[PDB]
Amino acid sequence: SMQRASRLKRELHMLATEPPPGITCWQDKDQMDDLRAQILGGANTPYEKGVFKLEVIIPERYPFEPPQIRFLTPIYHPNIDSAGRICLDVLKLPPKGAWRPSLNIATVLTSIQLLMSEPNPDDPLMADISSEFKYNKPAFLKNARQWTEKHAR
Numbered sequence: 001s002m003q004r005a006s007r008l009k010r011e012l013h014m015l016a017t018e019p020p021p022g023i024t025c026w027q028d029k030d031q032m033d034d035l036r037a038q039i040l041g042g043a044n045t046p047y048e049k050g051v052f053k054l055e056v057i058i059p060e061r062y063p064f065e066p067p068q069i070r071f072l073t074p075i076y077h078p079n080i081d082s083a084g085r086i087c088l089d090v091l092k093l094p095p096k097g098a099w100r101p102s103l104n105i106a107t108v109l110t111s112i113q114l115l116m117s118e119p120n121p122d123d124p125l126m127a128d129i130s131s132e133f134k135y136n137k138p139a140f141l142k143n144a145r146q147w148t149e150k151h152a153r
């Protein structure tokens with residue numbers, strides 16, 4: 001679809017020239033729908049000094065379906081499982097999710113960045129990590145810092 005291609009061209013230009021702070025997103029080779037991204041570990045978060053790589057697949061029906069995004073770098077977090085799947089509203093269509101064509105790759109990457117800083121323990125993919133975050137936050141922070149040191153630095 002030509003509407004999809006023109007939209008992806010504009011997004012790649014905006015991601016190259018006005019990337020959100022801490023965020024980088026690029027075409028892996030020669031396909032505008034096979035992308036990668038990088039989110040820097042946030043300051044005053046256990047991920048600080050970590051560098052986290054993600055895969056960003058643009059589906060056929062984009063912008064009417066959300067980008068398909070998974071972490072390639074392991075991360076220790078209530079809402080991200082050990083295969084890097086992400087539980088986040090803007091990555092799912094209504095009624096459960098909040099994706100709409102007014103959002104874009106940069107918006108949802110920023111949403112992931114914020115999720116890293118502020119987990120949603122009510123919708124976990126890792127129940128035990130989530131309980132740890134809710135009830136033993138110092139142990140969570142230490143385990144998140146250790147996971148970051150082993151896998152993201």
Ligand SMILES: COc1ccc(-n2cnnn2)cc1
Nearest residue numbers: 086087088089092096097123
């Ligand atoms: C609160 O709205 C939600 C939207 C999406 C999820 N998902 C989590 N993992 N896949 N989808 C959970 C809650």
